[PDB]
Paper text:
Here, we focused on targeting the 14–3–3/[name] interaction with fragments, which is a physiologically relevant PPI within the Hippo pathway. Briefly, the [name]-derived peptide surrounding phosphorylated Ser89 (pS89) completely occupies the 14–3–3’s binding groove.
We used the results of MD analysis as a guideline for determining the crystal structure of the 14–3–3σΔC/TAZpS89/[name] complex. In agreement with MD results, additional electron density from measuring crystals soaked with the fragment could be observed in a pocket distant to the peptide binding site, between helix 8 and 9 of 14–3–3. Although electron density coverage was not complete for the entire molecule, we could build the fragment in a possible orientation where it sits in a hydrophobic pocket with amino acids Phe198, Met202, Leu205, Thr217, Met220, Gln221, and Arg224 interacting with the fragment’s fused ring structure (decahydroquinoline). The carbonyl group interacts via a hydrogen bond with Thr217, and the phenyl ring interacts with Tyr213 via Y-shaped π – π stacking and via hydrophobic interaction with Lys214. The phenyl ring shows a lower electron density, suggesting higher flexibility or the presence of different conformations. The pocket where the fragment binds is conserved across 14–3–3 isoforms with a difference for the σ isoform, which has a methionine at position 202, whereas other isoforms display an isoleucine. To our positive surprise, fragment [name] showed a stabilization effect with a 34-fold change in the Kd value of [name] binding to 14–3–3, from 1.38 ± 0.44 μM to 0.04 ± 0.02 μM. The distance between fragment [name] and the [name] peptide is substantial, with no direct interaction, hinting that it would be difficult to achieve selectivity for the client-derived peptides bound in the 14–3–3’s groove.
Numbering used by the authors:
A (entry chain P), B (entry chain P): 86 to 95
C (entry chain A), D (entry chain A): -4 to 71, 74 to 231
The structure:
Amino acid sequence: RSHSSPASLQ
Amino acid sequence: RSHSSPASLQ
Amino acid sequence: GAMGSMERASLIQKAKLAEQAERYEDMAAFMKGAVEKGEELSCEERNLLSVAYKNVVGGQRAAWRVLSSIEQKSNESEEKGPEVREYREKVETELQGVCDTVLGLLDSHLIKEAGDAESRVFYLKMKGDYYRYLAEVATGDDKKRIIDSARSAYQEAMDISKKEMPPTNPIRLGLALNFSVFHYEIANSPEEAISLAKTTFDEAMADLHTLSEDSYKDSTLIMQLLRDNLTLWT
Amino acid sequence: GAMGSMERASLIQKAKLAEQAERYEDMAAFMKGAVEKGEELSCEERNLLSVAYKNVVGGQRAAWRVLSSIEQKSNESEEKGPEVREYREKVETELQGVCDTVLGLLDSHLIKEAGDAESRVFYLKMKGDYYRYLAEVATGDDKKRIIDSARSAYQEAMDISKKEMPPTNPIRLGLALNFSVFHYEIANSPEEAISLAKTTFDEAMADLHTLSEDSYKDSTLIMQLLRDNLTLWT
Ligand SMILES: O=C(Nc1ccccc1)OC[C@@]12CCCC[C@H]1NCCC2
Ligand SMILES: O=C(Nc1ccccc1)OC[C@@]12CCCC[C@H]1NCCC2
Ligand SMILES: [Mg+2]
Ligand SMILES: [Mg+2]
Ligand SMILES: [Mg+2]
Ligand SMILES: [Mg+2]
Ligand SMILES: [Mg+2]
Ligand SMILES: [Mg+2]
């Protein structure tokens, strides 16, 4: 698969 | 704490 | 909603406690309750909402992949009955229910009240993400429409982010990362995925010089994921 | 029970799938359904039952410890309201409910139908374990009775195991290990814990010579835990 974003974003 | 048994036992 | 009697601030406090305790189903229930109070969410609260549901759906996605793999192997040799399909379907239906819940919160009424770029992009990205998770398990006559719903949400978020946010903004970066994953994994568009990841990375690189040390750390963390995907994809 | 319409064999099959998918709440529900069919459980089925509930209660115990630590710190300095206590109580009540469910299955009617040493000791050990987990969170006027219920179940299991099983039997070893943990962590009897762990370990050592390679691996794995505890405790 592929890497997606972490849930928390600043 | 302390180590206890694994759930599966033969 | 079972959280109707709990104060908004108490729901937020308990969501943070649930996170510390790794009780993500509780965390999601508390954050759903907070959303249902009807007030807009702050940045920190939007992040709590996302952490909670991402962890819940993450466990379901991991389980679905295990079960789907077993099911596909069982069709390659001994007949084992309906149980693998049934249990994969059970997990799938629960996963779809969580995605529908998140999409429902976004539609009633988080997105329509979100006027600032940071909130609106965050929620439209989330909408794309939860349609993407639905697309991962979709197979019937609605799969194309689910894929297009993800694409449309991501595209609206992209259009706003490019106009309103610097290229290093972590929300903008995470959105572009996830839209690139959509292209590669869902839409059978690996070239689009690669091009988006490359352009996103290079435009962010060129804007790092404007950032403080702390912001630099936030942005480069997401940039590394773009690079990790480019390495997998090329 | 919501599993009343599912075949026993299908419940067992789905419990195994749930284990592979790390869906331990599902696994426990499937195994509860299997128990409620009223037939005795095989060795493999008893192990599935234990794995399922041990993982469920394990997540609850870990969460309870996190919350209890936060609660104790909040009483050492700013007042934060009732939320930490409330949420610790919520997790505690759920944990107690799981333990009560397991104890209910043992009492209705697994123990009373268990005639062979391997099954009866396994279930009495489980009874001790789930009373021990209740004792970990107990504070009121019933704590002493909960502790004594754990002790009584462990002692009955010990008495049978010493008469009916070799010292290397993994069930016997795991029981002695857990009873030693009860002594150290619950009953404020560290010397009893140390003595039990030492005698259990040495008597098992002396019986290893009777075992095949595979049985040796099973027994020495539990013996290593006895040793690990002795290192922590001395
Ligand atoms: O993480 C870092 N560096 C760093 C972070 C925090 C503190 C100190 C240094 O940048 C990662 C990336 C973008 C920026 C230049 C380096 C580059 N390397 C390939 C991937 C993207
Ligand atoms: O695990 C092993 N050895 C082993 C296992 C599997 C295959 C090969 C070797 O024994 C652990 C223990 C008991 C038996 C003698 C060694 C001793 N060492 C301290 C702890 C208890
Ligand atoms: Mg065959
Ligand atoms: Mg607004
Ligand atoms: Mg970041
Ligand atoms: Mg003060
Ligand atoms: Mg019998
Ligand atoms: Mg073993």
